UniProtKB/Swiss-Prot annotation, chains A, B, C:
Pfam families from the UniProt entry: CTP_synth_N, GATase
Protein name (database record): CTP synthase 2
Species annotation: Mus musculus (Mouse)
Family: Belongs to the CTP synthase family.
Membrane-spanning intervals of the chain: none
A GO MF label: CTP synthase activity
Key word Amino-acid biosynthesis present: no
């Protein structure tokens, strides 16, 4: 087996997960079966513990693993599906070792970081790297291990020590360390500052890992004198220092790695006998003259990364219909009349963006904060016939709203926002949380999503929800415009709903965005982009 | 006595010397006598060893100390004149300790970093901090010590260890540590990254210095959540975290420190019973509608810091005449006909900037590289009557050119560029280098500079030159337009020259820029700005 | 070329220089030309700056290099003669780099530890390792580099960083790191503590050097469980962990390294196609039934290392005559009547040891402290006919005393102790210090030392003295018992003196001990041991 460790210097946020994902897509293009492991050095067992504002979107796996958005980047760049244990954390490792200790598996010896935690990491990495994430029932050739955090993070040091040891088991033909670092430039008239990279590589070398590649992230291109200054002081050959400057689309980041000779490096070092899909997407993306203006009416909108998979699913869809996405990230609280009193300019800016909406997206979330502003946008979409996609909470809200405004059940709500709702239309219905892959069966042949999904009898999509439509109160909707077109395989759960009288007003109980890929846009997001540009009728006739 | 140590985190280039200088100007405005010490952890004994491209302009002191540009920042923000030993270096400290060892001053004991190097640093700091740089024959109250480099620089660690000890001699009412750090933001839609500051303060605390203040440098203002994230993880109170964002003029950086409560901090902690000069310069600077376009025809143009004092002297002058400076930094190599062949677009851009020149500045330098381009600009200035200031080399070239073009001595040059010049007009004339403060006597009452300097019989200016006008060959100029208006007190050295037939064409052998202050622009730079805007005649009548 | 770096862990004093010297003698026995370099990370330029109490005896080289006693260990274990620059120090390296900087040799670039100091170290090591110390005019095969101090010493870190780099120039077939560490055991009923060795190797690995061998120094043998505990936690194979316990003679330390497979390691790794001299000395040493009791009347007796070469020269001599040395180190201050008042028990113990003296040794030193006690012992030796060897100061005192007691010149002394001595018999006579190898010519054919030295016309011996016999005042001795048998080649300096009436009472102005080797005892020390056992007359007839 082969291992590429991707370590972070100075700051984590410089697209190290895009480097790791692009490294994987280069190896994929070279014909290798590639798997990926994320290490998050936090003590948290899973990302299901987090607010979206902490690390971005909580990405959901088929097995119901709630993981970091970098696992989503692996699944978007590589045609893989990951499992829970492809996310390593310090919490998972320490609990495993504690559980072993409490069983006496360590034979009455003093359990300590080296060896036992560092053994557990190597054990985990070896065993999980053999797992078929590629869908093909064959062990992969190469594992791209992203070591999250920075090489200054004290929690990460056990993993760096584990990899120092691992580098001597999996030899230098097997184990590669790529170090991703920031080269800041405070002003364009001063030197590009290599000192953070020098200091960061000195730290990494102090932990006993040698950079095979140093990836210098910068805004502008790195000057050749600055490249040589990195080479000398990091003690690495000029071929091993690569410049990843900012580029016009994500699709060029694999190409820039290719241009910088990373493909050559790995082809030489691994002995591998190109990225035309990436070049095709890239060159097409710059030439898109048309725009589709989508309103994302989100509550987590304060950091755009909170809806990363959602945005990427829209951009897959936008690219597939040859339009640029104008994603009007609206903070949903701004649409509420509370903000008309408190900040009237933000209110009228938000409502102006909602007027400019060719389509409206209401993504999922938990709680009532900003959730009346979601209802304001769904009401606007419903009445003014604007193309609508409601995800999870956005389905629940649409069902509640149709009950209020079209069935006159003004007392309808969720047993989330008001536990003692008079007609509890949305209710808590655990399985625990309905979490990971579930089969939704189509129960209406004339549904829009069925046809977008290829006229299939069922779909299997990723869920992350506790609340459901109350199955008695479906009787209110029975012969009215809002039709529950999709149900669970157990029947007693309504998983897709459509307005029969509207060109595109979809509620889905699942999260389609997690299943979206660059050349396979998730059909509910595709339908939104299609409807917003009038192409839906043409597409469905085609 | 009081001591403020200013330490650098992440990267040095974030204006830490402007923080140190602004800290001093705050204390100056509070009525304190302030001195300054620069520590440069390099093994170089002086900045006279450097190319300008290495650290910026080699600033020259009255005693002939060739020092870092930060000593120039101290002299510009504080009305002080510094001495050689206000620049500490590792070279100076280690040589001192070696010299002591070789005399047996360490009594046959094993000389080592702690104590002996760290004692030498504390010895030096205590003794030099008592020196009257303020011109007043009274020991200053406070010493601002800028620790150059970064807190990751291994050479700096002896000084941090020395200051750890010093903090226990000079107690916490005396000794303050300000830590200047970078908070980068890779994109405006991602978090402002405090992790470099966290890691940097953890390193500083590991070296046994506690931040009294953490100065967060950033482009944009720091968000309050980011400020609290710094406060928690750096283990410092919110009042001690200050945001220094980018601002519209240098004159606002003291004011922003004042606004962030740094003046309050030091007034409270030092027990001091405001920055109106700074506010006056700042608010006036933004309101300047007029522009003066100056061509800086400088061989070291590749980094603007190579002419920092020169640019600052022009900006002092520009502000004093209520004009904005359009400083057209021209690489003189681009004006040479070599570049007409090799890069014709750069040539015609450079010559277009030279056409747009309201005044022409030829700053000093060493070597023949770019000298023909300086001569091209001096020729242009001489013939087309464009206001000219030649500094040192620019005087030597003007004298050589007038000999070539006006006296027909086409064989004239320096014994620098051609040692065996047929008529050696500019010759090596050591005292070594004519270095630091020397008295130039005016020997022509009708000279422009005499009147700009206040109609004085002599001036004392800072020199840095080995070459002189050959005193025999002055006979060629004797009765012609180019008059040697200023000479040394020894007579045998020509130190200022003027074209009598030109509105402003000045050669000075000294560097006037080192003596320039914000409310006292150096008169040769003032005369250039005045001549370039026609105001010179009005000023000299006034 | 090949390089063995010998690095110190926990504490320096565990015989790391004996490991380095024994490593060299193993390679010597394998037929290699071996040179040695000592690095002392102190800022001191030479050991001539030190008191003997600081680091032990200041060993003197042929060129007049005053160096550490470890250079003496190299010269005793290897048949080499070293030069000044085989002692590297931080002082020497930093001064060299400063001198280069001041000449502009670093081309105006910022001089700093990495690269420039670490380059200077590698430069020095490469160039000095090519030097023929072996007397044969051929470059040696292997350089044993002892890195002095500990791997915790901050001054040493530049050398460890230099060797990290050097390990990548001189590859792993060329460059070996041996780490010498202490494994303490607080009581025999508790575990042998490997944690200092674990922590020390973790530090060394953090500096980027991997132990090829870990030498565990201990009192008792290392237990196999403790050896495995070192192996696991230091991350090294059991063959690379060696136990060097305490052994009955120095001659067994090469043999114990051989037994532990260090000879096998280097024979395998270097590809070399045994230590019988060492075994012969060792096995003979344990079987010596006879004892020779020598009084060493030395002012520096407080640390025995202050007379290391002297003690080793006596032990070479003792072994050569098949006697054990009872070296009665007497602090000469105890023989003085001052101590009869202040500490009468020490006085009578010292005088009892002087009564038990089969021979008396008065080693060299500087200053009047303990000189009266040396004179007391010389008086005792002179009158009671006890075999005497006076080295340098011991010659000067013997000449002064014979003048006082036998010529009645009671006013005689040195212009060291009393500058204004009435008859200045011992005077300052610089060449500075008469330092290193000088030719002493024999000028009396019937002298004892001439015959001990093989009946040679002259000898060349190592000197370290400023004072001489005043050549006029030789007229007092002219026809009396004290004959100046040896003079310098310049004649005007008396370098050996003998009492013609005494069986062995020798003053030598040089230090014979520095020239002494295990199978070539220095003849003045041999003559002392021979005279003290009556064998001198037999030897001189033989
Ligand atoms: C080392 C990184 O350095 C640099 C340097 N320069 C630029 C970027 C860069 C980073 C992120 C983005 C981005 O997020 N763009 C979007 C998108 C569409 S599809 C997708 N990702 S994806 O589906 O996982 C799979 C197909 C790729 N992202 C539109 C939203 N665009 C540019 N990154
Ligand atoms: C912690 C620093 O943070 C920030 C934040 N925002 C902005 C700046 C900033 C830094 C440098 C400059 C600058 O160099 N400006 C010029 C000038 C004129 S006078 C002088 N300096 S001076 O004479 O020493 C004495 C009077 C002050 N400089 C025009 C050339 N302008 C802005 N610095
Ligand atoms: C890694 C070291 O571990 C251990 C373990 N166990 C024991 C010792 C040990 C260390 C020093 C001594 C010592 O100094 N002994 C003496 C002597 C005679 S000759 C000479 N040295 S020598 O001439 O340089 C060359 C011929 C060798 N020394 C009598 C004075 N004896 C034993 N060292
Ligand atoms: O204020 C000062 C004083 C001294 N120095 C010293 O100058 C040398 C270079 O320090 P720099 O920070 O310029 O580092 P560099 O050129 O190696 O890396 P980048 O600029 O690309 O980030 C180091 O030895 C440092 O301590 C400064 O950087 N700044
Ligand atoms: O890729 C990953 C995985 C895990 N983590 C982990 O998340 C935690 C926060 O890591 P951050 O880099 O977000 O740090 P911070 O929020 O304290 O500081 P700034 O963003 O302002 O720079 C740390 O425990 C780290 O190891 C990541 O940062 N990124
Ligand atoms: O007082 C205590 C508590 C705990 N421990 C813990 O026990 C473990 C072993 O700590 P030891 O000091 O016994 O180390 P070791 O056995 O690896 O090495 P030596 O004894 O040969 O020197 C470590 O994890 C330490 O923190 C103690 O050593 N002592
Ligand atoms: N994923 C979501 O949008 C969650 C919706 C809702 N709070 C539930 O748990 O059903
Ligand atoms: N300061 C300068 O411009 C130097 C000018 C010239 N090279 C000299 O040495 O005189
Ligand atoms: N080496 C010695 O014993 C020194 C003796 C005496 N102090 C001198 O300087 O000559
Ligand atoms: Mg730099
Ligand atoms: Mg963060
Ligand atoms: Mg133990």
């Amino acid at each position: 087996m082969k291992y590429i460790l991707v370590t972070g210097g100075v700051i984590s946020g410089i697209g190290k997960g895009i480097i790791a994902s692009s490294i994987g897509t280069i190896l994929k293009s070279c014909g290798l079966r590639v798997t990926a492991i994320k290490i998050d050095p936090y003590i948290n067992i899973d990302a299901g513990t987090f607010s979206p504002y902490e690390h971005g979107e909580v990405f959901v796996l088929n097995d119901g693993g709630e993981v970091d958005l970098d696992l989503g980047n692996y699944e978007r760049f590589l045609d893989i599906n990951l499992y829970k244990d492809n996310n390593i954390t310090t919490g998972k490792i320490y609990q495993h070792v504690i559980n072993k200790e409490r069983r006496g598996d360590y034979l009455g010896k003093t359990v300590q970081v080296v060896p036992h935690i560092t053994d557990a990491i190597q054990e985990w990495v070896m065993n999980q790297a053999k797992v078929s994430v590629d869908g093909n029932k064959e062990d992969p050739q190469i594992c791209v291990i992203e070591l999250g955090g920075t090489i200054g993070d004290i929690e990460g040091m056990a993993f760096v020590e584990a990899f120092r040891q691992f580098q001597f088991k999996a030899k230098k033909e097997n184990f590669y360390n790529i170090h991703v670092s920031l080269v800041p430039q405070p002003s364009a008239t001063g030197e590009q500052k290599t000192k953070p990279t020098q200091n960061s590589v000195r730290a990494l070398r102090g932990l006993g890992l040698s950079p095979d590649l140093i990836v210098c992230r910068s805004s502008t291109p790195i000057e050749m004198a600055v490249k040589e200054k990195i080479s000398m002081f990091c003690h690495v050959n000029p071929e091993q220092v690569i410049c990843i400057h900012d580029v016009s689309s994500i699709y060029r980041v694999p190409l820039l790695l290719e241009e910088q000779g990373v493909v050559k490096y790995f082809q030489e070092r691994l002995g591998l006998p190109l990225l035309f899909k990436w070049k095709a997407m890239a060159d097409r993306y710059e030439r898109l003259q048309k725009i589709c203006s989508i309103a994302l009416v989100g509550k987590y909108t304060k950091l755009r990364d909170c809806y990363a998979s959602v945005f990427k699913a829209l951009e897959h869809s936008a690219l597939a219909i040859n339009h640029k996405l104008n994603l009007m990230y609206i903070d949903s609280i701004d649409l509420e009349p509370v903000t008309k009193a408190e900040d009237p300019v933000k209110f009228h800016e938000a409502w102006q963006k909602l007027c400019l909406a060719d389509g409206i997206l209401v993504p999922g979330g938990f709680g009532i904060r900003g959730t009346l502003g979601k209802l304001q946008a769904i009401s606007w979409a419903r009445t003014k016939k604007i193309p609508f996609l409601g995800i999870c909470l956005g389905m629940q809200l649409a069902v509640i709203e149709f009950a209020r405004n079209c069935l006159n059940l003004k007392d309808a709500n969720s047993t989330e926002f008001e536990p003692n709702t008079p007609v509890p239309l949305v209710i808590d219905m655990p399985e625990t949380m309905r979490l990971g892959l579930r089969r939704t069966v189509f129960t209406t042949e004339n549904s829009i999503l069925k046809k977008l999904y290829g006229d299939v009898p069922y779909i299997e999509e990723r869920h992350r929800h506790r609340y459901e439509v109350n199955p008695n109160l479906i009787n209110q909707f029975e012969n009215k415009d809002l039709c529950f077109v999709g149900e669970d395989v157990d029947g007693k759960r309504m998983e897709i709903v459509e307005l029969t009288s509207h060109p595109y007003f979809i509620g889905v109980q699942f999260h389609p965005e997690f299943s979206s890929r660059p050349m396979k846009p998730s059909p509910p997001y595709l339908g939104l982009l299609l409807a917003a540009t009038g192409n839906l009728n043409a597409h469905l006739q085609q």
